[PDB]
Amino acid sequence: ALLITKKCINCDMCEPECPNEAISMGDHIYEINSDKCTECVGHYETPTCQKVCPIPNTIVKDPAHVETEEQLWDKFVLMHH
Ligand code: SF4
Ligand code: SF4
């Protein structure tokens, strides 16, 4: 799953887009919920928030290492048959 890094400049571009509504605003910058991010696997060939992002601030994150079939299985449990 992805993370948004401190360069985020709070443009909201990325929130209406995420197919699994895992992005929200909070304390200082937009935040991605680890639990709900499939890195867009089952919806887009490329992670839709990196796509909209004007700055390139969204990165894979290291304390939330997922293999592609665990991303996949998140997508199927979320959206399902
Ligand atoms: S990579 Fe996809 S699922 Fe994850 S926060 Fe971005 S738009 Fe959402
Ligand atoms: S699109 Fe990029 S700069 Fe704008 S809020 Fe989302 S992560 Fe931050």
From Swiss-Prot:
GO terms for cellular component: cytoplasm. Pfam families: Fer4_7. Its cofactor is [4Fe-4S] cluster. Keywords: 4Fe-4S, Electron transport, Iron, Iron-sulfur, Metal-binding, Repeat, Transport. InterPro entries: 4Fe4S_Fe-S-bd, 4Fe4S_Fe_S_CS, PSI_iron-sulfur_center, YfhL-like. One of its GO terms (molecular function) is metal ion binding. [4Fe-4S] cluster 1 binds at C8, C11, C14, C53. NCBIfam families: di_4Fe-4S_YfhL. Ferredoxins are iron-sulfur proteins that transfer electrons in a wide variety of metabolic reactions. This is Ferredoxin YfhL.
